[PDB]
Design a protein around this ligand. Sequence first.
Ligand code: Q3C
Length: 167
Amino acid sequence: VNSFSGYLKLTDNVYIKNADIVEEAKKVKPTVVVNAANVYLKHGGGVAGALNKATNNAMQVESDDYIATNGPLKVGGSCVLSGHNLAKHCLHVVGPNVNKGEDIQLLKSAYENFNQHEVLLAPLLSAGIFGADPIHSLRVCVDTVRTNVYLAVFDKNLYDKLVSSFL
Ligand SMILES: O=C(O)c1cnc2ccccc2c1
């Protein structure tokens, strides 16, 4: 049994809810929240900016030190950093950004990072300002992630479309 509440069941391991991811993290304090990161861990907009703002910029300070030491992530890759006030850990995952011309086949590689964690709170990778089709992102998620994933969809309209169209 876990703390996640109100989630619509999709499969054996994937759950979905219309939720503000900052607000969900603040309430649950999950072991792992996933950030929709870029390779530079520059948390300007979307989920990354929202999450970072909720940490009072401490996520960005930590991220800048990580990049200064390790250099950029790979598209499809990830790193584990602090969850600050939101979670125990933040898994920063880089899905391909269609608005930069990145290979959408890298979306499966991105989701494979989730399998290293038994339970996660996450957004749909490569959705929103990353430019991918969220219906596609949900399909790749269900077909790739084997661990227990609780997906927070920001748009109520999109949430309803994802549920209604789910095979
Ligand atoms: O899911 C997103 O794309 C997203 C974008 N903006 C946000 C702003 C505040 C809180 C959550 C957000 C989530």
